[PDB]
Curated annotation (Swiss-Prot), chains A, B:
This is Anti-tumor lectin. Detected in the fruiting body. Residues 12-155 form the Galectin domain. It comes from Cyclocybe aegerita. The keyword Disulfide bond does not apply. It comes from the Eukaryota. GO terms for molecular function: DNA nuclease activity; polysaccharide binding.
Length: 158, 158
């Protein structure tokens, strides 16, 4: 029903004009896929869906060195909750080369995360509610994505 | 439920591994928005959703010179049906500059077309059925989009 486009530069957040809720979709598009970049500190790149109060509803962290993708949630002044890990970063991106897209489906009780065309995990939510903002963090030298990542939300779907 | 990514170069078509049906979404992403390009011949750019038999379920033609976007449908060896026109090409793209995305929502009886963040038209279908393939046509010199346009489909939504 509705589409919104956001240009997110590395290390910045953006507020959504249309929050994402159950039944909605969000896709992060990177024109690059630097899977052979230097080590993160410790994260090479992070993608995040935030609640109205700034809590990390979904934190996606890519670490080339540890060679794993971490998924977690946490309140603004709170600790990371239960960590979910998916091993082999490059493997999750296989299929589409040179660029990448991370799509998150809000399924109410879980977040379905698809890297390129592969569903990497069905994340059981640890914090619920609507997604009010987004962020993409990484340094200028070791991000696995382009300096700018386009985020596109599809809302009013349910 | 499912995501598929296709790289479509100007003047080519691609077959979908997952056809698009009622409730599904397709987005064409262009890293450029050449709204000041030379005249089309007559189309500067066209985006198409095709049926299993190759019929044009939805034909989107951008003509800078005529300064209008045309929407129509037709069978492979048939004539264009009822033409729907939207005047002022640049106006439909306003809001997002430098790049562009055309999203099509298959609503069963109609196709909702969103250019960037603006719903440009609720197209009453003249030919029904599932979308089996996609295409992006334009010359190498006057397309309003980049040489390569990424198409992303979101299927299994209904």
């Amino acid at each position: 029903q509705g589409v919104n486009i956001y240009n997110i530069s590395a290390g910045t957040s953006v507020d959504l004009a249309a929050p994402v809720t159950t039944g909605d979709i969000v896709t992060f598009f990177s024109s690059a896929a630097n899977l052979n970049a230097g080590a993160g500190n410790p994260n090479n790149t992070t993608l995040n869906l935030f609640a109205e109060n700034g809590a990390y509803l979904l934190h996606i962290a890519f670490r080339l060195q540890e060679n794993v993708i971490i998924f977690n949630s946490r309140q603004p002044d709170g600790p990371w909750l239960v960590e979910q890990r998916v091993s082999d970063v490059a493997n999750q991106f296989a299929g589409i080369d040179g660029k990448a897209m991370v799509t998150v489906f809000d399924h109410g009780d879980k977040y379905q995360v698809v890297i390129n065309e592969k569903t990497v995990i069905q994340y059981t939510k640890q914090i619920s509610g609507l997604t009010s903002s987004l962020s993409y963090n990484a340094t200028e030298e070791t991000s696995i994505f382009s300096t700018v990542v386009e985020a596109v939300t599809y809302t009013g779907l349910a």
